[PDB]
Design a protein around this ligand. Structure first.
Ligand SMILES: CC(=O)N[C@H]1[C@@H]2OC[C@@H](O2)[C@@H](O[C@@H]2O[C@H](CO)[C@@H](O)[C@H](O)[C@H]2NC(C)=O)[C@@H]1O
Ligand SMILES: CC(=O)N[C@H]1[C@@H]2OC[C@@H](O2)[C@@H](O[C@@H]2O[C@H](CO)[C@@H](O)[C@H](O)[C@H]2NC(C)=O)[C@@H]1O
Lengths: 144, 145
């Protein structure tokens, strides 16, 4: 594939943190019908292609900057965002499902603690969450 | 210390799986808020993010009620299922779509800077890049035919 087709290490390298996004309201607060729906900060339409539109911090990667992003592809800096600051990228995908599956999808090892019986109730789930020996870890997962 | 290193988890059996995130929202479930069935899992339990969170899996692999420890997510109780959740597949519940984007989808990686931009980009410039002759062989893997 493209990752192996060229010696990319001849180009400058930048460590970044990257998430995915779509043109939809969950990312942009805009919906179909809005005048600027689907349009990046630069004015060009969002695109997932050989060269895809990506979001970055203009002070780090100016608009028009061409990047190669492993496991995503070639990217042209065309968009920006309030949360997109510093060494941060946001990668355009067509659908929320694509963000979940093409960037969010992770292969990893999980530990099987107890085989289930086929049932679970609210009471049992509450009992598990009230486990005394684990309350010290609980604030790390509770939102409230 | 983090839960991920507070116990010798390798004492327990290990299962390689492919995992994604989901929410109660319509993008995942097709249900809208106001629906009395909104946020209701297959097991009849309400979706929950907590010490023990509700996760989705294939019952034939992980029966309902199965407790897992998923690194960088937490302890999970299999309480949900899904048409696409088959085989060694897990779907991890998050409260919002942004949480799925940020808390699961966020990756630290190196990218290569091919060319620094001038501060402007046009549709025609982007089109010409995508029409690069020597790269049309690679284009099938990114374009959605
Ligand atoms: C919270 C946050 O930073 N959201 C970003 C996320 O990353 C890129 C994209 O989605 C971004 O949306 C773009 O915001 C810019 C600044 O308000 C707008 O000028 C762009 O038109 C908008 N892009 C699109 C495709 O709508 C969000 O602001
Ligand atoms: C595409 C797909 O499989 N989506 C899944 C995704 O993973 C778990 C959850 O979201 C799942 O939603 C649950 O579907 C089950 C039937 O398949 C229903 O019985 C559950 O009530 C439903 N869960 C919720 C919280 O609505 C989606 O079907």
């Amino acid at each position: 594939p493209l990752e192996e087709a060229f010696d990319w290490d001849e180009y400058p390298v930048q460590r970044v943190t990257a998430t995915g996004y779509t043109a939809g309201a969950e990312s942009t607060g805009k919906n179909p019908g809005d005048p600027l729906y689907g349009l990046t900060y630069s004015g060009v339409k969002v695109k997932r292609d050989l060269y895809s539109t990506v979001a970055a911090d203009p002070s780090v990667f100016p608009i028009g900057t061409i990047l190669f992003i492993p496991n995503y592809g070639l990217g042209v800096v065309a968009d920006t965002g309030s949360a997109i600051k510093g060494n941060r990228l946001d990668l355009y995908f067509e659908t929320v499902k694509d963000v979940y599956n093409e960037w969010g999808k992770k292969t990893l090892d999980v530990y099987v603690i107890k085989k289930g019986t086929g049932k679970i109730t609210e009471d049992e789930l509450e009992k598990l969450n009230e486990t005394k020996s684990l309350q010290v870890f609980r604030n790390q997962y509770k939102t409230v």
